[PDB]
Symmetry: D2
Subunit: 450 residues, 4 copies
């Protein structure tokens, strides 16, 4: 209910609110989505403000009393004690200056409860600009999401898929190409392909980390580092690596590229989009294999969570669609920078951090509550394998290339199986027993598993 | 922390939660995004459950005391009193069955507090299925968002752009093509173009409403209407039209197309994506025309809300990026239906309803706090038009294209008007009077303004 | 290899080439894709230059013998006689001025072969600019593609789908929701849904034509109409509508909007993208229903079009559904390229026109041609596996619901369990549990378990 | 016309055509786009057919005289002598079966001219399927395009941008953030940022090559390798590496993943889409820097190729839009595989090969005919930097905020340098010396450049 005073008039701020006038003005300016920064973004901004205060204190630019108060207040924010103190819309000034100032004001208020006076700009924002802070917090959050959350979740899914690839190594079935009956495969072979797709997904995330982990901090307003110490960036990054354990964080290769563009987020989103494409194929194959039971393929049974509807495959395919959409928004913002600043950072941050979160959470649920509990309908799968087309090649050593070719042509002409065409042509004899025919054409042998 | 008993056993539900066991199971099954239904889809689910109870009562299928209890509870949900009673993630079973059951459970808990016992399935879900209700609610929410909120917001922006077009009718300036100087226009003419883009946007939204307003209700599980009265659909739609005033709501032309596909949302997103494209052009031009104050175009001054940064053009271009991403997600879900049900409905609903909300809110903000307060640097704009090499063409018939090109070169080098350069070069004679010069170089006449 | 002189040097030009120095400069400047304008864009540039000459002649601005030479030359271009004379890359100056000048030069060279000297700029480009012509030709081409080609092809597919809906009106089968067994439908009902998606697609194309048909012609360099007659736009549109029969063409509502933006192409692409979404669902369902035959759903048989495999000689694949789904993917890609160019205009001109024109006209062409092939080579010849589909419907646990009021929902569920376990029809299972008696005759069982009546067919 | 035959019977084929029955059926089945395989794709199919015949001959499965005839025919195809004999549409069967048979039939017809009888399926397609040959030919073409064409084109553009970064190292100018005047930078620093974007693009392409270079060859119909030698793939890949010098070509890690999905093309397209995003930023900035010559920024002059219109920036930004569109088509195909085969290969191949070609060709043109020739308006750039309100801040501690604001306002109004305004306002002596003024306002020192 309390009032504050701003160099354009009077500002009313809620009573239990640690934010001040600049934040309140941003609240009134951007009532667009009704959604603010996520826990991960707030955490990153607190981590960054603590590291900046630490470096400003080490360089003798900030009195140690003020630094200690900023560091303690920032630690509270990084630990999630103030997630309710960040009310600014995602759809704000495109630098993220509004959220940067929100962090400065909340730290100033937390410090005042402890008896220390901080200026949000001159103290909490010392050596920083309105323009190198929010992109840095974005890349911290995205790198933490990749390394600490997504990669382990994808590994859990990979390991679940790989476990089925081994458990079903000899569970023969019919191949399907173009949705049509094809030569035999095993259910384990198919799952070995799903596992490879997730393993390649982890490789793709790893491959983007050298650029995703680049931080703009130290570049200040335009990338030149004016009004910051020359080594501010390298010193702040070392504090962040030590606090977070994220060795993937690093100073930008080029301080102009790191502020004029967000290409690292565009690159990372392409890795997440590829994983969404992989997850769509895996999830679609799994719900088709589970389909029916009478009208479908009925190859496997999915665990029942809610005739079991494939509710986790539907959650996975819906997440994949969202990641594809978010990826388009990210590329659109990425392309539209101008001169020294890309001003799409809040929108790009929301979208990539959501894509990380959705893929992390759905991959773990898919792994644990769908893949791990799948059961194969082994006898049904063998009946499908025993209904696949056969080939004459494995008879060559027995009947010769010429008789084999005549078997092939007559089977095609009369729409008969290879097996029955061999019987009908009277080839069961010294060259070939019925047991020899059955060994040579065995559907597990045709799958070339063992 | 109260206890409830399901098929599969025990489940704890918060004390003050009005949802029951099936919602709490869905909370446990889908911890993916941490974002549930928006206030417009919760409202629509309420409007729909009220209308269904009305019709079941009208047809003598549901006891009137039970129908009255449903209608009273549904009106509270429609009025936004229970937005906190819908905790299920967007990324749920693709039919939206979980959120349909959430609505049925919340209505039964509200009715219970007024002394009336309702069965969530047998009473609140009477005549309905898990597959025709959620997409009906989605199309009610989207139609209401288009008619009641977006069209009026767009008309407000149209009227602000049109008002500036009139105020700046004679504000002559340099045209620009390929970013290069061109013959004269007025700011009014440019703003008349912006206004047409927004008027055409309203035409595009109106043009999608015949199909956006199609409702699946009555089609039950697969579109056949098995286990509903034959006229359930037309009765429920008529009650929704009577109660909401939305005459755009209609029973679907084909009950199978209305459940197998969500093509109406794909179509409406296309209109929203086109408006986003328009708004990007308008917002980009306005921030470029405000660029400066020294090294940019310096054509206009934007009202200062937060070096006056174009923060509302940034909000508008970020919203447009989000609408473009959401549009890609919607089309992806739309294409991937199978047989009798498209199972991407929760993801498509989130995206379409967000696109409507963002465009509505940012259009009003852009109109009121950017467009209405723009001010033109009238003298600068006319002096540059009068100094541009582009305007020497109408001198050619008096002094020839070679002397006209010398005038253009000296005017630019000396930063003089074309008029002053022609006088300084001693061209005023019988060949060319001062009055013929002023006629030939009348830049506002060159713009050909009404 | 004849040589020419531009206001900036000498340029070598092929001997049989009707283009001249500005076009040859554009050829050397933009070796990017190796693809130029399509027949439909060249036709529209010819129509436009012919109409402009007719109007300039009627207004006393262009000498009659010069106008007549332009009209004759422009008719040859519109008739597809010169599709080899437009070598400039699609990825050219973003106004399309290079292609505008290509048209003006080729007309000048055609007129020269009949003894008339035309100045490419002063005669063939009279009353026009480098900025209002190419987007006009783009919108002519797109409107013609929508009205004369896409809508008729979509109508042919609609009619083929609707004919199957009528033929299969009693072909009962189990519904599928979430890919799981559901209550009965008919294959005619499902095909009625596909028909409605195509009919809605035609409605979406129609709804965009009031803005797709808006032409910029007459707005000249910046939209103001400086250096054109005040009524040049309405006069040229009148001639184009009269000669083409394209009733949807009109002068832009706002001459600035018509050059600063290409929002009509973005709008129209959304309709094509929605059609691509519909065709994806239709084509996917059809290839699933054709799947197997032994390991798939085997609901229908697609006409055989070509051998599928040398390793599996009998195998035939759903090649038309695959062409349709691949076209749909291309339309979705093209749609993203069009929106991208549409958003990025500046001030008086959008400079993405050649790229947006390539993408929109290609989407029109691919959907037109694949729709006709899908209708003729796939839908028309489909056959239903009627006995298969009825057997599954009659054995479905989903159909026990109508027994509730005779034997109660618990005995109905037990019938479902036993049927599904013993691979029996519901009818037979009801019998094998001795439930025929006082509550339920054998005729009353046959009424309740009538799967076609449960589909509720009209 | 002549008569040819396949397993479905008799087909009329143009008398002179080198293709046979299956190609002609495909000509009639797929008249959709009117465009067929590109040179690069026909080249790869020829390389692969030759390598397969070499390995079949080395394993004693194919007669040396037949292998020689195939290798010679395949060489003519790879060289481009028969591009007119590949009439099949891009939009064909989704495995590329039709273009595989086109290659087999054309090789058979060429071999027949030389008096050798080859069966298109039994000899030219020995040990092969379409399912492994067409994606192998697609990944050979894409890997070649990446390594031999795109990376060298991007290196040329990087080197032109880096040459400018050096040439313009001391060309001081106004920074611009939010399109608004900011503290100084140099054109050199801006160009260093563009150079980094292109170097990072090269790093993105190199990071995708471990998976783009994976070939399916040897997996035959379903991934199992049925009807091929167990080492067919390792042997064919060694021949292709020897013949192409592309060490990036490798056996697939998993034979099922390599046929059930095309994730490597989706991944590579992501890299191309990021480069398009970068090139959009670079081209936009360059055309805005060239804007004018009177009413725009007038920072640089572009070389004149056709009011010098920025035609190469326009070509670059149109190419970028096409790469973004193609990228969406590729991802859509990538996701929609089923079981053992993704059947979007011809469409995904068209799009990713086009994206490689357009970026290759436009990057070389941009580097040579735009970047190399730019000239800077050095005096204008410095005068505006020296005249900008943004550089008054370092005076704050000598003259006070109020007087720094008055200096900035007078400098803008009079169009004077900040240095001359401070002198004109009488502030030298009291507040600071000339030596102090020249140190505080040195715009090249403020850019942190020397
Ligand atoms: C003179 N200071 S001012 O008024 O405050 C001012 C501010 C901003 C400006 O462009 C953003 C300009 N433009 C110009 O000086 C335009 C111009 N005219 N004539 C030339 O020969 C020339 C040469 C190179 C570059 C530009 C030009 C002038
Ligand atoms: C002076 N003719 S010129 O050199 O040929 C020229 C050309 C182009 C320009 O901007 C594209 C400019 N800019 C300005 O005049 C900048 C400017 N300075 N001071 C003012 O008080 C002012 C007020 C309103 C708008 C701009 C200003 C100047
Ligand atoms: Mg580490
Ligand atoms: Mg079956």
């Amino acid at each position: 209910y309390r009032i504050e005073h701003d160099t354009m008039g009077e500002v009313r701020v809620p009573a239990k609110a640690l934010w001040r006038a600049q934040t309140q003005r941003a609240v009134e300016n951007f009532p667009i989505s009704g959604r603010g920064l996520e826990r991960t973004q707030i955490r990153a901004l607190g981590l960054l403000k603590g590291a900046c205060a630490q470096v400003n204190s080490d360089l003798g630019l900030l009195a140690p009393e003020k630094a200690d108060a900023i560091i303690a207040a920032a630690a509270e924010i990084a630990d999630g004690q103030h997630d309710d103190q960040f009310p600014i819309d995602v759809f704000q000034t495109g630098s993220g200056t509004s959220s940067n100032m929100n962090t400065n004001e909340v730290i100033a208020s937390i410090a005042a409860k402890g008896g220390v006076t901080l200026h949000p700009n001159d103290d909490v924002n010392m050596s920083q600009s309105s323009n190198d802070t929010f992109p840095t917090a974005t890349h911290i959050a995205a790198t933490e999401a990749a390394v600490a959350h997504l990669i382990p979740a994808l590994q859990q899914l990979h390991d679940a898929l790989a476990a089925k690839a081994l458990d079903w190594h000899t569970v023969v079935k019919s191949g399907r190409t173009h949705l049509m009956d094809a030569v035999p495969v095993t259910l384990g072979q198919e799952f070995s392909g799903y596992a490879r797709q997730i393993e390649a997904g982890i490789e793709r995330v790893r491959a983007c980390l050298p650029r995703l982990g680049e931080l703009a901090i130290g570049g200040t307003a335009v990338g030149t580092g004016l009004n910051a110490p020359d080594d501010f960036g390298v010193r702040v990054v070392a504090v962040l690596v030590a606090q977070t354990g994220l060795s993937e964080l690093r100073t930008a290769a080029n301080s102009f590229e790191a502020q004029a563009a967000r290409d690292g987020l565009v690159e990372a989103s392409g890795a997440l989009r590829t994983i969404a494409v992989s997850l769509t194929k895996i999830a679609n194959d799994i719900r088709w294999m589970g389909s029916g039971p009478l009208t479908g393929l009925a190859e496997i049974q999915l665990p029942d969570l809610q005739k079991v509807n494939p509710v986790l495959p539907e959650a996975v395919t819906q997440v994949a669609a969202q990641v594809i959409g978010n990826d388009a928004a990210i590329a659109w913002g990425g392309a539209n920078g101008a001169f020294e600043l890309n001003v799409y950072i809040p929108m790009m941050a929301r979208n990539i951090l959501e894509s990380f979160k959705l893929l992390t959470n759905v991959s773990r649920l898919f792994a644990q509550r769908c893949i791990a509990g799948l059961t194969a309908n082994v006898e049904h799968l063998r009946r499908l394998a025993e209904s696949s087309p056969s080939i004459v090649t494995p008879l060559n050593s027995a009947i010769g290339y010429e008789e084999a070719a005549a078997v092939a042509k007559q089977a095609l002409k009369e729409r008969k199986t290879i097996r029955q065409t061999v019987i009908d042509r009277g080839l069961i004899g010294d060259r070939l027993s019925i047991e020899d025919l059955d060994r040579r054409l065995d559907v597990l042998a045709m799958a070339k598993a063992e």
